[PDB]
Amino acid sequence: WTYEEQFKQLYELDGDPKRKEFLDDLFSFMQKRGTPVNRIPIMAKQVLDLFMLYVLVTEKGGLVEVINKKLWREITKGLNLPTSITSAAFTLRTQYMEYLYPYECEKRGLSNPNELQAAIDS
Secondary structure: OOHHHHOHHHHOOOOOHHHHHHHHHHHHHHHHHOOOOOOOOEEOOEEOOHHHHHHHHHHOOOHHHHHHHOOHHHHHHHOOOOOOOOOHHHHHHHHHHHHOHHHHHHHOOOOOHHHHHHHHHO
């Protein structure tokens, strides 16, 4: 019933209390936004660590900076995944846009969708 029980595999990836706080805030935000998350994406036959993916990308300056600086191999490495998973850059970018980028603009304000579309084009 709780987000933690619904997404057990995601909440149990580590014992950092910031994991639970972030994820409860993220799923509440998404539900209030009218875009609730019903299933966590699966990357390399495993649950995508949305908490760690958010920490790594925002630590590098956010989605637009990761795209512009071409840092997807560093993000993949940071997620303890082989960098050579052929479409890791596209999979991680799309997933971030769908599940984490609205939360990033709200909480960190690192960019706007206009700066994002221009970043993908270049």
